[PDB]
Design a protein around this ligand. Structure first.
Ligand code: HEC
Length: 80
């Protein structure tokens, strides 16, 4: 949820509705709305890092547990 993201400093780089440093959360929700295994694909990007999908700034890997990574991915998916 929104609190889980704030506590893990997602929000320092992401807004729900707008681009700050990382893509807007809702744009991520929409890009992967169709996508198979979207949630596990996202969980993996959240824990492992990301580079090149949205622009030149890389996202550093974030130290969350598997369970939090999954809940944050499932949550972003609902921001459609
Ligand atoms: C700034 C230092 C960041 C913090 C802290 C978090 N994220 Fe991020 N994110 C950031 C950038 C610069 C990018 C784009 C990277 C790229 O590939 O171009 C991203 C991207 C994501 C994505 C989408 C990945 C994809 O393959 O499409 C997700 C789902 C995402 N970020 C989520 C996320 C969460 C849940 C965070 C809290 C733990 C978080 N990010 C931290 C920048 C930064």
């Amino acid at each position: 949820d929104a609190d889980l993201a704030k506590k893990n400093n997602c929000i320092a780089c992401h807004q729900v509705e707008t681009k700050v440093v990382g893509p807007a959360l809702k744009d991520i929700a929409a890009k992967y709305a169709d996508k198979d295994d979207a949630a596990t694909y996202l969980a993996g990007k959240i824990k492992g890092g990301s580079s090149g999908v949205w622009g030149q700034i890389p996202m550093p890997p974030v130290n969350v547990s598997d369970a939090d990574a999954k809940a944050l991915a499932d949550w972003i998916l609902t921001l459609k």
